A = this chain, B = another copy of it.
Amino acid sequence: LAAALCQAL
C-alpha cells in the first residue's frame, strides 16, 4: 500500500 503514495507523488 505504501507504494500507492510513491506513484501519486
A→B interface (CB under 8 Å)? 1-2, 4-5, 8-9
**CA–CA, A5 to B3, complex, Å?**
11
A4: chain B residues within 8 A (beta carbon): 9
**CA–CA, A9 to B2, complex, Å?**
7
Extra contacts, 5 of them, besides A4-B9, A5-B8, A5-B9 (Cβ < 8 A), are: A1-B5, A1-B8, A1-B9, A2-B5, A2-B8
**CA–CA, A5 to B2, complex, Å?**
7
Which residue of chain B has its CB nearest to the CB of A4?
A: B9
A2: chain B residues within 8 A (beta carbon): 5, 8
**CA–CA, A9 to B1, complex, Å?**
8
